[PDB]
Write a protein that binds this ligand. Structure first.
Ligand SMILES: [Cl-]
Ligand SMILES: [Cl-]
Ligand SMILES: [Cl-]
Ligand SMILES: [Cl-]
Ligand SMILES: [Cl-]
Lengths: 323, 339
């Protein structure tokens, strides 16, 4: 039963990028997750003037990627099946410019450097028109370090929010990550939930979004929706990074499986008002065995198994963003 | 002057002279003080389509460029993206479409457009929506300069109603065709064409950077796969079949804009029909090495009649008919790019 973080009403018409001399800030969030995943670095930067920001996953060697993009409001750039970086940002479609800043910083750091970017609309959660721009994307890349992720209000999660049946009940989320290692297998989940729905934990409790100040209690949106019909008639952007070799077909199905699994932690999900986008990335370092047997079952070591495990890592990340 | 049966019976005079791109690790944008140039190409197409403006700008230092179609009202859009080998937005409603060189780096030009549009609006949908697509034009020149935010802003600022610069202009500056071997690749250009039939308006814009070659309605290869040893261009299939017998022994970005109202389903099918029709003028097309992308846009100004009949047949006035007509406009635009 966490304390509320109501976004409150936006005032539109606020100052935009041209009104400020905008200084990138390295985002530290509420706490740092530390993880051991060689070849994967994360940077996050924000403008306090927004507040809004960008988070970048940099895999310098390049990595095979599948994109699973769902619903009616997707704002995506690049979308390559091979990337050196994934950039997530606020600022709606304007924030895609941060990915150009990353592409720039990748050149300066130096044949094509490939960056895929996705965004959330975060303007209703604040009272300015500031967006992540080329300078902020460059900063995020420059700030990237191995094995750290800033949880909470950091990078793209600065002004992310959940539970949009009515904006009077919408709460600020954050960004979240989680990491697991099993033998040599490594899985990192990164998520920026800006859902129309709410964040739900494994017991079914609504933990962020749709908080009613009149009652002090969060509701699952379906209870509002059903009563609304009875009376009247008559986006999340995310990445899963692993080191297990998967074919293009396996990686694409893995992406779909993990992305669907997020309707456990975010409800509703994949709605017409969401543009949910998941990047599944593999560093292609570890082979799955040629046969899928173990003591735990004849069909227990395969890409479906990896998908189920990664789905748990992603639910933990979603809960970190909502914490 | 002759009975009209085939398309060839009714043209664009393509220059037979070669324009070989020639063989290509050179300087990038910050090596230069880059000033956008308004692109005028080899000639200006003039057309009457209020609400639609086109601007084109280039950097001579590339040479590379961007071409922007601005529809300030916003327009419903279908994207048909068809191959292997860089898109931004791909929204189902757009205030602008930005086509650029520079491979994926040139998607930055669309951000320049988006930012300029946001500034004119002094973030509620007051969101300005720009979809961008790119071609890889780096093999056709010796620098790494790409269309950036400033160049996209400049293309938008240079946009005028009712004009389009044909040839080596905007995104077409360093486009090229015919890539069985780079020794036979020729520079293309960008091209546009426009038809008004009754109240119906159709504008085609294309930037062909194909693996394949540009082909006219008679079947003659007119740009790409020019063999300097023979002085002629042949269809790539002759090279491919000879290659197989020997060794295995016993992107185009485009937009089609119309004023006719179509539902989301009709528009998406219209996009697929027109895009496929381009395998007539570009061959091969939709290959694994191409990332072909077409934007089909309607300004939703006029309705088709409720019934599809006419003196020319029971099923003659419908979106399929519109797609067939628009396909010819697009082939003309392809030929203008190769001229
Ligand atoms: Cl929102
Ligand atoms: Cl839980
Ligand atoms: Cl090329
Ligand atoms: Cl600029
Ligand atoms: Cl012809």
């Amino acid at each position: 039963d966490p304390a509320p973080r109501l976004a409150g009403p936006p005032v539109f018409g606020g100052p935009g990028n041209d009104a400020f001399d905008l200084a990138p800030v390295r985002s530290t969030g509420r706490e740092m997750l530390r993880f051991d995943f060689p070849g994967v670095s994360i940077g996050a930067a924000h403008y306090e003037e927004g507040p809004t920001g960008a988070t970048v996953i940099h895999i310098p060697a390049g990595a095979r990627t599948a994109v699973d993009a769902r619903g009616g409001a997707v704002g995506l750039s690049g979308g390559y099946d091979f990337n050196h970086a994934i950039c997530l940002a606020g600022g709606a479609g304007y924030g895609l410019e941060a990915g150009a800043g990353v592409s720039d910083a990748l050149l300066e750091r130096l044949e094509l450097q490939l960056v895929s970017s996705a965004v959330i609309y975060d303007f209703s959660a604040r009272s300015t028109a500031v967006y992540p721009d080329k300078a902020l994307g460059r900063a995020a890349l420059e700030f990237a370090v191995p094995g750290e992720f800033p949880q909470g209000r950091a990078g793209a999660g600065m002004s992310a929010s959940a539970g949009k049946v009515d904006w009077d009940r919408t709460e600020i989320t954050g960004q979240g990550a989680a990491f697991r290692r099993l033998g040599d297998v490594r899985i990192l989940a990164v998520v920026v939930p800006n859902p129309v729905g709410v964040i739900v934990d494994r017991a079914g409790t609504v933990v962020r979004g749709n908080y009613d100040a009149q009652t002090g209690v969060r509701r699952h949106p379906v209870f509002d929706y059903q009563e609304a019909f009875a009376e009247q008639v008559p986006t999340t952007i995310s990445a899963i990074v692993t080191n297990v070799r998967m074919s293009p077909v396996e990686l694409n199905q893995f992406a779909k499986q993990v992305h669907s699994s997020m309707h456990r932690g975010i409800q509703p999900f994949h709605t017409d008002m969401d543009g949910d986008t998941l990047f599944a990335v593999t560093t292609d370092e570890i082979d799955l065995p040629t046969t899928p047997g173990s003591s735990r079952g004849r069909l227990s070591v395969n890409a479906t198994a990896l998908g189920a495990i990664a789905s748990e890592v992603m639910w933990d990340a979603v809960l970190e963003a909502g914490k």
